[PDB]
Amino acid sequence: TGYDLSASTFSPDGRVFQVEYAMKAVENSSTAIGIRCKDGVVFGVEKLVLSKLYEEGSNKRLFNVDRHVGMAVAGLLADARSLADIAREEASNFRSNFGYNIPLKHLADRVAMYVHAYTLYSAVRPFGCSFMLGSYSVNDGAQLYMIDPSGVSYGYWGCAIGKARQAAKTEIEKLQMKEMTCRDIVKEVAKIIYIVHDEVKDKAFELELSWVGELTNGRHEIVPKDIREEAEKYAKESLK
Amino acid sequence: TTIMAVQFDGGVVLGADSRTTTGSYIANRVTDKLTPIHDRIFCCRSGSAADTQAVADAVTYQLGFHSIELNEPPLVHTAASLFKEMCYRYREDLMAGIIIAGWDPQEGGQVYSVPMGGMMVRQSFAIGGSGSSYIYGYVDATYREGMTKEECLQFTANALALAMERDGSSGGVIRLAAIAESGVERQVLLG
Amino acid sequence: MADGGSERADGRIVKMEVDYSATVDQRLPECAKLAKEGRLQEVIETLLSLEKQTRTASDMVSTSRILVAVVKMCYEAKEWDLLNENIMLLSKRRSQLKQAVAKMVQQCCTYVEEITDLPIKLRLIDTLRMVTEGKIYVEIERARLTKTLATI
Amino acid sequence: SAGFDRHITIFSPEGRLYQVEYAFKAINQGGLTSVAVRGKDCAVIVTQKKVPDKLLDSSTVTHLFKITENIGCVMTGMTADSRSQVQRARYEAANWKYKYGYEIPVDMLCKRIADISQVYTQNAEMRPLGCCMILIGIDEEQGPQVYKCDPAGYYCGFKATAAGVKQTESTSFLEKKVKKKFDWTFEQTVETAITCLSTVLSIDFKPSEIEVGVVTVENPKFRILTEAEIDAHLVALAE
């Protein structure tokens, strides 16, 4: 209301309204949470079918950036695809220049600088994405990071991105997060996603769960969720 | 000329002659042929001088900048990969006999070798220099797996002694370097 | 904490009755950190109230019985360090001070009449701190009026 | 006034420009406090953390950024500008080390960072990196140093130094405190830093919220204190 056009200009009270408007763009996006255990990091995304036109296995927001790192994006999908390609490129340069796996702090700092560089100038807009970054290493343990649309990148035990950002972490934080291995945390994330928004505004949603840790020996892939089928036989027991 | 690096259980031990010559005249009688890069990782050079000096300065730059940005002590294999890239990129113009050694907290003492081509390999001991062929003759005779520090010092002492004695270009004085978890130990011997 | 102060109080109920006031020295960091934790409204204030009332009994047995004026300065330094690790903005945790110093100046009332006026007036110059720096209260400063009347 | 709506970096009438004096409170949206003190052969940084979450970590909330092995810093303001400024500082210190063969003095580094911010200010079509930076380091023949770098590109450096949110009050306490001519025997420095932040913010809190970065002419390496010795200093000033 006065000056919020360019991404270079300041306000009479000193903040950039472009960055705020891009931050609350992801607020309308789907709910995506993440949490780590003592030997791994678990992702989970509330994903919704439009009406009946999807195929249940298209456009998966669970990407796979490096051999041990993947994203859990939410927001504008194509911008997240481009950012995932940039992250693949950065891990490519590191693997080509130093001969070992990228530490997640350095990767997150390069990605944060790339996002900040798209927030700086006036020709371009800030990104409309907010994503998660998990990892595991034998000499480092489990690491879960978090990048906002502005470019502030730091670490968590658990997080949530979407509508129910507070309404997930209200009952995320009552989890005994340290003493659990991630194979419990699979159905834990299942119940957390299943709590929020069963039928209220939309009609139907669908669950994806990504999975990295010591049990994959350092690999990162989606769970065989059909194996052990841990949502629904507990989701039907989570309504009471 | 003649440079040498032998690892043991606790750490590594380096060694070189000095005697940088040009043709048949000695230009310089005593030389720091081995070069600190980080506080725990060395490299010792041979071949041409300006090539290895410029490469060592740029590697010191890149490695110091990278290890400060990590806020962690660097790896040895990292410096070996950096020397590999810079050697391989200008093999048309460089003559580097760079041998990387150094103790590491994660992986202990390691020795890497980069000859005139630009390949990188891990070894338990290495030779280098034009007058290294001879102690390369008997380094597979006298060496024993699992030495102590003093056995490595006496071993490389006899080695660099005979290399300096036999080759015309080699000679000068013996410099040693001992890298372990404890400290960096340089000394100047003759005998 | 709530139980954190309940333990200290519920334990020390005989630790000073006949046992010397050395378990006080064994309980000084106890009450100190109990106040430090400092529950918002009433709980840890009730705990500190029990603690300072046990300390009033300790005053009866040491500062009102032995009257050293050094044990008085010791209790005052105890409460001093306690308030050094405590805000007391009238932050619903001040019974550690209000009625504590109320019974302290009642001790003074019993002191100027019984103890030599010099140790009690030392206690009084310390109560000067206790209120003039510790958010002076009306009736506590009515006791200040009668105590400067005692100085008269 | 404006009028001109101060959208780009031009000169307004009588006579100032409004972009940089809007950038001077991009620090103030950080919600954070920093204090530096130089008394004697030591130098002390102190800065608190605002972590409301138990799910959030504690190691990676660190604002003390070890620039080089003898130079430390602390940042306030927004985080992205701060971290990018820190990597520029590290890169240019490494450039010094490559070009000139020896360790950079802390003065030239602040000059170079200020010049980068001025070039970001002189040419338009770039945001002027709204974060403030305080540096410390030891130099031979000059002792310790404390410097401040502005988002405008105005470096300065001085004895008792503070920037953030509440530092009119901090400099009021440091005028009312650095006026008596006593020496500063390193625990005098730590005690005055803790108590100046303890009088500005008036909290008197656990040893787990503030971060203390020190450098001393006995070990010129930059050094971040541990919870045990922070607790030791805090109860050492507890009377």
Place this chain on the structure above:
Amino acid sequence: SLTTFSPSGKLVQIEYALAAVAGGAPSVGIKAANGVVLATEKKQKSILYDERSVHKVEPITKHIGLVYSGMGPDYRVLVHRARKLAQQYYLVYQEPIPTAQLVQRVASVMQEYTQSGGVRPFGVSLLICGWNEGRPYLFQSDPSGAYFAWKATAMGKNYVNGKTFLEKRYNEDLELEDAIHTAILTLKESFEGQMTEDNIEVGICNEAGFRRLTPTEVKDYLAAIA
């Protein structure tokens, strides 16, 4: 912005930069018979600041002094440009550059920044001086690219008042010491009441070379000079 003229007047963005110069810290500079005296007025905001870090009086070569009245952050930039340019002249000709050629090239640089259309002008007015070939000089520039030649002048707050004192006080014939005396007089006319060994900062230019005076002799001289 900077690309188009007014209906009748002048370049408003240069006039505003001149106003920002006139709103700056005061200074005075006097050309005498044998030397040139420069003097600034450098007040710290608090009692905390150090007076050994930032320097107003700054040499360009060993015999060329230069002060300003404006913003240090632009001052240092065009100082560094003048450094590199003077060393390029000394590369080309192997001879220390004359001050007129310095003022030409510095004016060319400032003029190039006054050209269109994204960069702002400097908010800096210089006072350049030097002792080239016996006769010393004094050259004032401005943000507009122009330059002048003075016998004695001032820039900053109350430059009009200081200049009307300079017209009355100064003359044609003095020495360097009498020049410093009248310079600290006309700077003391307009500065604050507490003027110490650190609030001022004075460099001179003898024919033997540039000399930047110390706080020792500055405190010795301004210890109630009149």
Place this chain on the structure above:
Amino acid sequence: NQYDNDVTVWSPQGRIHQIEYAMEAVKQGSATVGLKSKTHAVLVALKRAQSELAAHQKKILHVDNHIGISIAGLTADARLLCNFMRQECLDSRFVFDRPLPVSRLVSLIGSKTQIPTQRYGRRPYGVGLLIAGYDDMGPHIFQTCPSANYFDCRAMSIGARSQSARTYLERHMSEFMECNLNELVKHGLRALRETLPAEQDLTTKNVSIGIVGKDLEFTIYDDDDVSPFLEGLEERPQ
């Protein structure tokens, strides 16, 4: 509404309306329908003309030996992405000496159309791609959008009044999976005969069918191998 001019500007509700306007520009193309069986993928479009005497503007165009696209919207961007498509096909056909999987090609299409949707100085591409192909795992029916958010389906339909087509696809998507080519194609035109107003009927010259098969190369048909496809019908239920 004064923020509603360029691609760069985020809205105060976060919805960049240039993307919405490009979507609405896609909504004014011709109707087209693509749907696959387990072994054969068929996409059918609708032709139009400028006048009676003129020929019809074609929609199904060839790309590669196993790739063919439908289209709706602009034609300059259509041929631009066509040339880029053929180029990236013959690029990998040169280098790897294999046919391309479809998914990486459409990821390259999204990465191609990303740049004109984020920087300033290019418009988002008004484009209506319906892509049929064959990797090792059978037929694929992908669709694109000017927002580059490409979808995979089993049967889609884009263009003007294509929603009744979608209702038909809803009530026969279970039936689609089993059948061979002929009744599959006539399900496609039993979507197209509801993409039309009821007072006129689909003739020969206005319809186009392109079949790609697991052993069958991609082939376009016009009126003459479509006269076999147009018989085998009844009237609409009037």
